């Protein structure tokens, strides 16, 4: 079988790239199967996606906070302003990231006034969600969000997103 099945057998949810309305119903269905099978074993999630939507982001954020199994987020590659929220929504002390990670935080993505209103609402909701986990204030995150902030693995440990950086386990 494909390696994705062998990973899911070990309760591994490999989030795909460019998560959207169609790619969220598959990751929200795996969080409900592993929670009913074994409710005390943790669930790890390898984060790799160059951005995505927001209408489906809040549907996975609370879903990760609704299951009883603890979430261990491991950042692989980058996270373009959408996967960083899921990386910071994991269990405190189990949020890991490779030393070559790029935690990006930028702006997410009548039909002109209500559109700007919904954009401001989702922006302040994302900022509140980020400040709830990182222990910071919404003003600082809003000041660091207007610019295309590019955080490295070492710059994200003291920022509040990740708690530990994984080292190389090479025997030679």
């Amino acid at each position: 079988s494909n390696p994705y099945n062998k990973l899911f057998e070990e309760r591994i949810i490999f989030l795909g790239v460019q998560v959207d309305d169609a790619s969220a119903n598959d990751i929200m269905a795996q969080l409900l199967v592993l929670e009913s099978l074994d409710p005390d074993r943790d669930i790890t999630m390898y984060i790799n996606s160059p951005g995505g939507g927001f209408t489906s982001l809040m549907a996975i954020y609370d879903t990760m906070q609704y299951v009883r199994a603890d979430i261990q987020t491991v950042c692989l590659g980058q996270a373009a302003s959408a996967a960083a929220v899921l990386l910071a929504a994991g269990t405190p002390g189990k949020r890991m990231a490779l030393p070559n990670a790029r935690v990006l935080i930028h702006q997410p993505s009548s039909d002109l006034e209500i559109q700007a209103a919904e954009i401001e609402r989702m922006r302040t909701l994302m900022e509140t969600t980020l400040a709830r986990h990182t222990g910071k204030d919404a003003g600082v995150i809003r000041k660091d969000t207007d610019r295309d902030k590019i955080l490295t693995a070492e710059e994200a440990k003291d920022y509040g997103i990740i708690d530990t950086v994984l080292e190389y386990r090479k025997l030679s």
Partner: protein
């Protein structure tokens, strides 16, 4: 040229301009160019402006309004077909006493429908929408609080209702 491109040119020599499509970044430039040409040809006549537009944007119609105000001639605006959220502003932009309307016109008092720069896009749209609500009250003479209530309801009008509302001044039933 073509058939529809020759009649418009022949009517341009008689100081007659048309607007039969939704005003956008294209039609607005042609309208301002025609108005400026008719103003440079003669500065002592009138420019008939037949309005029939099912819609359009406000950022493009504001330029047409400024061009109409800049021209030293006397714009005579007519309601040929139906005005929908952009033809009424140009119909009432003409000089008082030359705003006519056909007996089967439908003036729709309504506001126009409308990345990372959406904030400034909403701020720029909020500074020209209130300016339109001021010029509409200045032209029609109605209180300012009336158009802000008649704009969201999509209240359609007729040639007789628009006459008593303040949009037009006459109803040409049989004239020249």
């Amino acid at each position: 040229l073509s058939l529809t491109d020759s009649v418009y040119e022949r009517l341009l020599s008689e100081r007659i301009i048309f607007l039969g499509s939704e005003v956008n970044d294209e039609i607005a430039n042609r309208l301002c160019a025609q108005i400026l040409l008719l103003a440079a040809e003669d500065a002592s006549k009138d420019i008939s402006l037949y309005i029939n537009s099912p819609g359009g944007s406000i950022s493009a119609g504001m330029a047409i309004y400024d061009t109409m105000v800049l021209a030293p001639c006397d714009i005579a605006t007519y309601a040929m077909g139906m005005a929908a959220s952009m033809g009424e502003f140009l119909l009432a932009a003409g000089t008082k006493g030359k705003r006519y309307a056909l007996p089967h016109a439908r003036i729709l008092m309504h506001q126009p429908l409308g990345a990372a720069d959406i904030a400034i896009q909403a701020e720029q749209f909020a500074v020209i929408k209130k300016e339109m609500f001021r010029l509409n009250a200045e032209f029609t003479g109605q209180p300012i609080e009336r158009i802000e209530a008649d704009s969201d309801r999509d209240r359609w009008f007729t040639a007789a209702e628009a006459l008593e509302y303040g949009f037009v001044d006459h109803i040409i039933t049989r004239a020249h």
